[PDB]
């Protein structure tokens, strides 16, 4: 069993950037094959980015390639997603996922992932913060 906790979701201006984090349970250097998925309201869940268990085959969905960067800190069992040039189409709950098993290559299929976090919400929408 692997538990997964995402953080970092928030409200972001169109054109803006965020960084998501996903902490995974286990001893340090557990080195899971992991991925990010997302689901927008009324749409099917979809792959975003992934990495294999041994740190190879960093892979992106066509929707986000060149805008998003996936990285893993093996010591912390943490996965990070730097998201740039965000647009309304990127609004979604973002889910961290992990596989049970030592898979070298990243799978883009949700059926490949045993464990799923609860998600963190990214809202890409124009807004104004009142001054202080
Ligand atoms: Mn803001």
CA-closest candidate to residue 97, choices 40, 49, 28: 49
Check the chain for breaks (C–N over 2.5 Å) and list the residue before each, or none. none
What are the residue ranges spanned by the domains of the chain?
4-124
- If you measure from the C-alpha of residue 128 to the centroid of ligand 1, how many angstroms do you get, rounded to a whole number? 7
CA-closest candidate to residue 26, choices 70, 71, 72, 78: 78
- If you measure from the C-alpha of residue 1 to the centroid of ligand 1, how many angstroms do you get, rounded to a whole number? 37
Contact 91, 28 (CB under 8 A): no
- If you measure from the C-alpha of residue 28 to the centroid of ligand 1, how many angstroms do you get, rounded to a whole number? 35
- If you measure from the C-alpha of residue 16 to the centroid of ligand 1, how many angstroms do you get, rounded to a whole number? 9
CATH number for the domain running over 4-124? 2.60.40.10
Other CB atoms within 10 Å distance of the CB of residue 49: 25
Contact 35, 51 (CB under 8 A): yes
Other CB atoms within 10 Å distance of the CB of residue 14: 14
What is the C-alpha separation between 53 and 64, in angstroms, rounded?
22
- If you measure from the C-alpha of residue 37 to the centroid of ligand 1, how many angstroms do you get, rounded to a whole number? 23
Query: Which experimental technique did the depositors report for determining this structure?
Result: X-ray
- Element at 59 (helix H, strand E): strand 59-60
What is the C-alpha separation between 84 and 68, in angstroms, rounded?
6
């Amino acid at each position: 069993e692997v538990q997964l906790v995402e953080s970092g979701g928030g409200l972001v201006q169109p054109g803006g950037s965020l960084r998501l984090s996903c902490a995974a349970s286990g001893r340090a250097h557990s080195d899971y094959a992991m991925a990010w998925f997302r689901q927008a309201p009324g749409q099917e869940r979809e792959f975003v980015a992934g990495i294999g268990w041994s740190g190879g085959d960093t892979l992106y969905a066509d929707s986000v390639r060149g805008r998003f960067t996936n990285s893993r800190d093996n010591s912390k069992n943490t996965l990070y997603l730097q998201m740039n040039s965000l647009r309304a189409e990127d609004t979604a709950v973002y889910y961290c996922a992990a596989r049970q098993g030592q898979y070298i290559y990243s799978s883009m299929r949700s059926d490949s992932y045993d464990y799923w976090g609860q998600g963190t919400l990214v809202t890409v929408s124009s807004h104004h913060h009142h001054h202080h």
